[PDB]
Ligand binder design. Structure first.
Ligand SMILES: CCCCCCCCCCCCCCCCCC(=O)OC[C@H](COP(=O)([O-])OCC[N+](C)(C)C)OC(=O)CCCCCCCCCCCCCCCCC
Ligand SMILES: CCCCCCCCCCCCCCCCCC(=O)OC[C@H](COP(=O)([O-])OCC[N+](C)(C)C)OC(=O)CCCCCCCCCCCCCCCCC
Ligand SMILES: CCCCCCCCCCCCCCCCCC(=O)OC[C@H](COP(=O)([O-])OCC[N+](C)(C)C)OC(=O)CCCCCCCCCCCCCCCCC
Ligand SMILES: CCCCCCCCCCCCCCCCCC(=O)OC[C@H](COP(=O)([O-])OCC[N+](C)(C)C)OC(=O)CCCCCCCCCCCCCCCCC
Ligand SMILES: CCCCCCCCCCCCCCCCCC(=O)OC[C@H](COP(=O)([O-])OCC[N+](C)(C)C)OC(=O)CCCCCCCCCCCCCCCCC
Ligand SMILES: CCCCCCCCCCCCCCCCCC(=O)OC[C@H](COP(=O)([O-])OCC[N+](C)(C)C)OC(=O)CCCCCCCCCCCCCCCCC
Ligand SMILES: CCCCCCCCCCCCCCCCCC(=O)OC[C@H](COP(=O)([O-])OCC[N+](C)(C)C)OC(=O)CCCCCCCCCCCCCCCCC
Ligand SMILES: C[C@@H]1CC[C@@]2(OC1)O[C@H]1C[C@H]3[C@@H]4CC=C5C[C@@H](OCCC(CO)CO)CC[C@]5(C)[C@H]4CC[C@]3(C)[C@H]1[C@@H]2C
Ligand SMILES: C[C@@H]1CC[C@@]2(OC1)O[C@H]1C[C@H]3[C@@H]4CC=C5C[C@@H](OCCC(CO)CO)CC[C@]5(C)[C@H]4CC[C@]3(C)[C@H]1[C@@H]2C
Ligand SMILES: C[C@@H]1CC[C@@]2(OC1)O[C@H]1C[C@H]3[C@@H]4CC=C5C[C@@H](OCCC(CO)CO)CC[C@]5(C)[C@H]4CC[C@]3(C)[C@H]1[C@@H]2C
Ligand SMILES: C[C@@H]1CC[C@@]2(OC1)O[C@H]1C[C@H]3[C@@H]4CC=C5C[C@@H](OCCC(CO)CO)CC[C@]5(C)[C@H]4CC[C@]3(C)[C@H]1[C@@H]2C
Ligand SMILES: C[C@@H]1CC[C@@]2(OC1)O[C@H]1C[C@H]3[C@@H]4CC=C5C[C@@H](OCCC(CO)CO)CC[C@]5(C)[C@H]4CC[C@]3(C)[C@H]1[C@@H]2C
Ligand SMILES: C[C@@H]1CC[C@@]2(OC1)O[C@H]1C[C@H]3[C@@H]4CC=C5C[C@@H](OCCC(CO)CO)CC[C@]5(C)[C@H]4CC[C@]3(C)[C@H]1[C@@H]2C
Ligand SMILES: C[C@@H]1CC[C@@]2(OC1)O[C@H]1C[C@H]3[C@@H]4CC=C5C[C@@H](OCCC(CO)CO)CC[C@]5(C)[C@H]4CC[C@]3(C)[C@H]1[C@@H]2C
Lengths: 51, 43, 41, 57, 318, 318, 51, 43, 41, 57
């Protein structure tokens, strides 16, 4: 709050965070699954619907 | 617009001719199997 | 007499509320009394 | 004369409204029994076949 | 000092109370288990789910749908663990809904949710929830779109509390604080809730201080049948609707049917047509307009027997 | 004189021709047996049929429906006999459709149909059809709304002829004459049709002199599978659509699926869920708009085993 | 045609016939069935949906 | 219209009081099982 | 060359007709050649 | 500089259109296999059970 300029800064941080969540959140979940699931599936099988 | 009295005669005459050639077509079809059979006899 | 029960149930500002409250009272007594179990089960 | 026609008008209108309600009521009852009774009867009927395979053990 | 706490805590536990669960679950048995409201849909729907592991839980899901307000496609993936649960799903239009729950303590869990619509379209919501589950109560605080950049607090803050009064009776409270615009004054609402739960029946009520009242009653009609009643009164004109419904549990299918005071009849039939395939038929009929909405859906689960050796991770914070 | 007729009729029969059936059935195998066009519907439908006898055929039917352009209720009754068939059905709105077919001679039959809408609404149609079925041809004349009260003929007159040319090839003709208003001049159309039918496949074409062309091909793909193609060209702008479909006959169900050049996919599954109950699921999908229409219907037949002793009356003129 | 008056007459005949078909056609079919079907059903069963 | 500066103080004060009486309600509920148990002891 | 086949199939006044005629030719040859039976039956 | 930005604009637009078509194609293929393959597989699968009861005679 102290500087209005800072308020724009924080505003830019939210728009930065917003993009990272929009693009990176689902890849993050898939990364957590693929690297930590037991056993480890195939890269194609990781997104395969029923094979 | 509405058709004139002489335009109706023209339309009624053309319509009658088409129906006469339709009946003429059915007459040819009715006789048609005798012709196609004749062609197979030649072969 | 009955006119005071019909009007307040179908042609009054609060008539919509009374129907829902009555349906609730009947449905709960239907279930809790055991009549529902003897019919639906 | 006109008194009978008025009664005829009162009756004709009221009966047409009576049949419209009575007909509408039969439809809603019939449709409900179909929409509820058909899936239930199929599911319940299948359950009885599975129950039969258990009783045969 | 602990001298008072020791006697207080010991006397507290002597009354045999138990955790009453979340306020939002005060009517789960009626509104979610028996009534069809949450299952109704129209058009065609197909869900393809692949499970890659059970501990940690990890699965991928593809939904194809063609119907009223149903997005043509929705990808989803979730990862769950005894201390955490991450879930994300995105529409073909780029609408991303996310969930991230983490158990800081077995009694304290944080739930964060994001809804990120395309940039120009819509608005984005950020919901931070903090749930505390005590020996006999639950406390929750939700902050939705919190903001302090204008020099003052802004957003929606919801406080929830549910307390076990007796082994069967639980009473609770809901409080809301809203100040979307600093220029506008804060608006606050308080709602009272309570529930009486026994083995065979459950009674619940939610009373908004503004006038609305929602009461529900659930009763088990034997081993395979259960039924419930849901009454909603709104006085914001006066409007009231009562829904009565029942649910039948068969060995291979579940049938739900409900009727309500507005003359709407609906039923949902879920049937296991195969080991991995579950069929769903949903039909809604409005008797005043004689219009019907039919929904046919399928659910398929690829993982099957491959992963049965694993067993699900305990108490994943769904 | 009979001297010519005797040689003519004997030579006629020596070529082994057979009755080619009605012109309107020239594409029945594709457009009615294989394609779904006539079975597609949306919403809910239930038909309750009670059969009271098989000879004479007499049955009563009640249809309940809630869907697009489906009348809420339709009562129907029919009476059939070796020489006659009377059928009537009336909507909840008073729309009465009637049929009355009578066999004056085993080769000559008269078909009369009436559609009587409420008096103020709509228009009433009266259709008188005269079908003659010869040893190797069929001739038909339909008069729809014939009128002579204005001092001249008025209405729609359709002449139909189909002739067997060889044991497999049949060729035909269709002629229409129209003069709804005496003030307006008559309008006339002629359409040519033909069909080549073999044991395993059937080819048909209908060519309107105005430019439209409809060709269809049907082929049996084994004992349980048959498929067909239907092409329609309209040049009244230029528009063309081709529909390809197949039908599978299982022991308890029939599955139909078709795709067409306009990207519409549709399928119809009819399954005998019980001896008197037949379920029908119909789904239409438009791939350009991603919109789907789902239809679920049931058919029930009360008469069952009570009347099986009787066997259906022969060749009822349906 | 000979008298316009007659043309109204014929017009009235169609409207007379139209009403008879509208009201009497379905009862006629049901009468034919009930009195000629073998065996003869019950009057209530005659219009019963599934009993 | 928009609220005046003194109308906001009134609204903010009423809102604060409601939230204080909500927390006061939770305090009574938290202590409530001790009271209801006491009633059963008397019976 | 190919431009004369693409334009007449998707961006011409008669393009709608050509697609339906081509689909018919392919579907009939698919059935009559026996490829349909070997796949669908 | 600007020449790379133009190529970036040409590529970004074209790829977005490419993925939109490719994604739309996968959906129509998937939906068709579901709408046709599901009812067929259920009907055909049931037919095999009836065939089994005949082979056991
Ligand atoms: C059982 C018989 C009771 C009444 C049945 C028909 C009598 C009136 C029908 C009518 O006019 O239609 C009105 C209703 C509703 O129509 P409506 O109210 O929309 O308006 C039509 C009524 N008029 C034109 C006269 C104003 O139509 C129906 O749905 C027909 C009733 C039959 C429905 C179910 C009965 C069949 C199955 C049971 C055997
Ligand atoms: C109105 C709602 C009901 C209308 C449908 C008509 C019922 C026909 C069903 C046929 C019954 C049958 O086959 O018998 C099964 C059986 C009959 O058999 P049984 O078990 O009673 O005895 C038969 C004897 N043995 C076991 C040897 C075969 O009945 C039941 O199991 C009890 C349930 C009765 C049917 C309940 C229908 C569904 C209820 C859903 C919701 C109800 C309330 C919710 C409100 C919404 C509904 C509008
Ligand atoms: C490793 C990860 C691989 C698989 C995970 C799926 C994708 C992960 C996140 C997608 C990124 C977010 C997309 C986005 O920004 O959307 C904005 C746009 C909004 O459309 P727009 O262009 O109108 O909006 C403009 C706004 N910007 C500039 C941000 C684009 O959405 C799309 O691009 C539409 C499709 C989004 C996702 C569709 C489904 C997900 C992927 C398909 C299936 C995945 C696997 C199946 C095989
Ligand atoms: C971790 C937090 C991540 C930062 C942004 C969240 C992701 C973006 C999103 O979906 O929402 C953005 C939006 C931000 O937009 P906004 O708040 O300007 O308005 C709502 C959205 N629009 C603009 C479309 C109307 O969501 C939020 O409200 C963010 C709230 C959290 C930001 C800061 C965290 C808490 C700070 C104060 C706490 C109280 C003391
Ligand atoms: C013995 C016969 C018993 C059973 C046979 C069924 C009825 C036979 C013919 C119905 C007469 C025609 C009705 C008519 O004129 O409609 C005009 C009106 C048109 O509605 P309107 O009033 O808007 O039109 C005004 C025009 N006039 C003045 C002619 C009425 O239609 C109706 O009355 C609506 C209902 C007609 C029929 C509905 C279903 C048929 C009967 C219900 C079930 C039958 C048995 C099931 C138990
Ligand atoms: C037996 C015939 C029964 C007479 C009327 C038929 C039943 C009513 C109906 O549905 O249609 C009425 C209507 C009569 O109305 P219309 O002909 O004035 O116009 C059509 C209908 N409206 C008025 C609504 C636009 O149907 C007909 O067209 C009747 C045709 C047959 C009438 C006379 C029989 C043949 C006479 C000449 C034959 C050629 C030589
Ligand atoms: C297989 C992967 C190929 C491409 C899949 C996603 C890539 C593009 C997705 C996209 O942007 O959506 C466009 C399409 C249609 O959207 P559209 O064309 O209406 O517009 C969205 C595209 N933007 C915003 C970029 C202009 O969306 C989808 O339907 C998603 C594609 C996935 C559908 C089926 C794949 C899942 C099952 C197979 C595994
Ligand atoms: C304030 C409003 C007015 C309506 C209403 O609240 C809202 O007022 C309540 C009064 C309740 C009934 C009181 C007493 C019993 C006896 C009980 O025990 C019998 C034994 C059983 C075996 O278990 C059968 O023998 C059965 C149930 C019944 C009838 C209650 C039903 C529900 C009722 C109708 C409630 C209803 C919802
Ligand atoms: C009054 C109105 C018309 C009738 C109706 O109410 C409204 O009354 C209900 C009676 C129902 C039937 C009861 C029992 C069964 C058996 C079940 O299982 C058989 C398995 C088979 C295996 O071969 C033999 O074992 C199949 C379905 C069926 C016939 C029901 C169909 C629907 C019906 C007709 C319902 C319908 C909605
Ligand atoms: C905030 C508001 C306060 C009211 C409320 O929330 C909203 O809170 C609950 C209080 C409940 C009642 C408390 C106690 C009993 C005794 C019980 O006794 C059966 C026999 C038993 C011995 O008593 C077995 O041993 C019958 C039912 C009844 C009256 C409850 C009915 C439902 C009520 C009214 C619930 C209602 C929804
Ligand atoms: C009014 C218009 C006239 C054309 C048409 O209606 C519209 O009328 C039919 C004439 C048919 C052809 C006639 C004869 C044969 C010989 C046959 O031979 C196979 C082997 C056989 C020995 O010949 C077995 O022994 C192959 C097919 C073919 C070419 C027909 C194809 C379909 C055609 C074109 C039909 C088409 C729809
Ligand atoms: C005027 C309209 C234009 C479209 C159309 O008419 C209507 O044009 C016709 C061409 C026909 C095919 C011609 C020949 C054969 C070969 C035959 O095989 C026997 C083997 C034999 C020769 O190969 C030697 O043994 C099977 C049938 C088939 C494919 C015909 C199918 C129907 C077709 C496609 C007709 C189609 C409907
Ligand atoms: C005028 C327009 C152009 C497209 C078209 O009409 C409209 O022109 C026709 C030409 C036809 C093919 C001619 C010859 C045969 C041989 C036959 O016999 C093989 C033996 C079989 C075993 O039975 C396999 O070995 C198979 C079929 C095939 C390929 C015809 C297919 C249909 C076609 C493509 C028709 C198509 C509809
Ligand atoms: C690529 C995309 C996803 C997958 C898909 O294409 C599109 O590929 C198809 C394969 C189909 C399955 C094949 C075989 C059967 C067996 C049948 O019978 C079992 C009876 C049971 C008795 O207990 C065991 O005997 C039940 C159905 C099932 C599993 C099919 C379901 C639908 C599936 C998944 C179809 C789906 C549309």
């Amino acid at each position: 709050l102290g500087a209005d300029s800072k308020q724009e800064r924080i505003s830019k941080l939210i728009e930065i965070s917003r993009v990272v969540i929009h693009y990176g959140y689902l890849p993050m979940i898939l990364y957590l699954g693929y690297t930590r699931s037991e056993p480890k599936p195939s890269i194609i099988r990781l997104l395969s619907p029923l094979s | 617009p509405q058709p004139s009295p002489e335009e109706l005669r023209a339309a009624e005459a053309e319509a009658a001719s088409t129906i006469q050639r339709a009946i003429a077509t059915a007459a040819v079809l009715y006789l048609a199997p005798f012709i196609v059979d004749a062609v197979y006899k030649m072969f | 007499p009955i006119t005071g029960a019909y009007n307040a149930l179908f042609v009054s500002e609060n008539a919509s509320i009374v129907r829902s409250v009555v349906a609730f009272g009947l449905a709960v007594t239907f279930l809790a009394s055991g009549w529902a179990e003897a019919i639906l089960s | 004369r006109g008194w009978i026609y008025h009664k005829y008008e009162q009756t004709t209108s009221a009966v047409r409204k009576a049949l419209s309600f009575a007909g509408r009521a039969a439809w809603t009852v019939s449709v409900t029994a179909l929409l509820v009774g058909v899936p239930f009867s199929l599911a319940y009927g299948e359950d009885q076949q599975y129950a039969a395979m258990e009783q045969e053990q | 000092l602990s001298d008072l706490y020791d006697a207080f805590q010991e006397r507290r536990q002597k009354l045999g109370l138990s955790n009453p669960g979340l306020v939002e679950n005060i009517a789960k048995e009626v509104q979610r288990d028996v009534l069809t409201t949450n299952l109704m849909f129209s058009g065609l729907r197909a869900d393809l789910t692949k499970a890659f592991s059970l501990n940690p839980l990890f699965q991928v899901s593809h939904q194809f749908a063609m119907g009223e307000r149903l997005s043509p496609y929705t990808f989803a993936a979730l990862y769950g663990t005894s201390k955490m649960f991450a879930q994300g799903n995105i529409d073909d239009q780029g609408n991303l809904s996310t969930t991230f729950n983490y158990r800081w303590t077995p009694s304290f869990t944080t739930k964060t949710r994001f809804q990120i619509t395309p940039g120009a379209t819509g608005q984005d919501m950020a919901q931070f929830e903090h749930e505390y589950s005590g020996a006999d109560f639950t406390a929750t605080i939700k902050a939705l779109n919190p903001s302090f950049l204008e020099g003052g607090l802004t957003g929606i803050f919801v406080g929830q509390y549910l307390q076990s009064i007796t082994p069967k009776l639980s009473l609770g409270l809901e409080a809301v604080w809203q100040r979307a615009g600093l220029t506008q004054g804060p608006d606050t609402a308080i709602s009272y809730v309570g529930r009486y739960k026994t083995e065979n029946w459950i009674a619940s009520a939610q009373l908004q201080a503004q006038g609305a009242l929602n009461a529900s009653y659930w009763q088990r009609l034997g081993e395979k049948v259960q039924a419930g009643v849901d009454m909603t009164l709104s006085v914001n004109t006066k409007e009231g609707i009562t829904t009565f419904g029942a649910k039948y549990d068969f060995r291979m299918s579940t049938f739900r049917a409900q009727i309500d005071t507005k003359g709407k009849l609906s039923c949902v039939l879920e049937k296991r047509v195969a080991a991995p395939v579950m069929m769903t038929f949903a039909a809604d009929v409005d008797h005043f307009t004689q219009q019907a909405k039919v929904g046919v859906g399928i659910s398929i689960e690829a993982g099957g027997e491959e992963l049965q050796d694993q067993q699900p991770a305990p108490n994943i914070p769904f």
